[PDB]
Symmetry: none
């Protein structure tokens, strides 16, 4: 018998790195 | 017959860098 | 037959966590 077909696609990666700081607040 | 399907593929790469955070608070009265 | 080869690489993961809040705004 011939080799079977390829397996299913792998699972998604894990989540990425955390983002950078947000914008400064407005003036007081 | 043909053999069974192979094992699942490799896990994908990690996602992208996260978005910038929300804004800071207002500055002080000085 | 013998098992098939591994499947294709998974998709990329989700975006990382948001960054922290920005710093305070300028002094009044």
């Amino acid at each position: 018998g011939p080799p079977g077909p390829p397996g299913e696609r792998g699972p998604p990666g894990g989540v990425g790195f955390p983002g950078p700081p947000g914008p400064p607040g407005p003036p007081g």
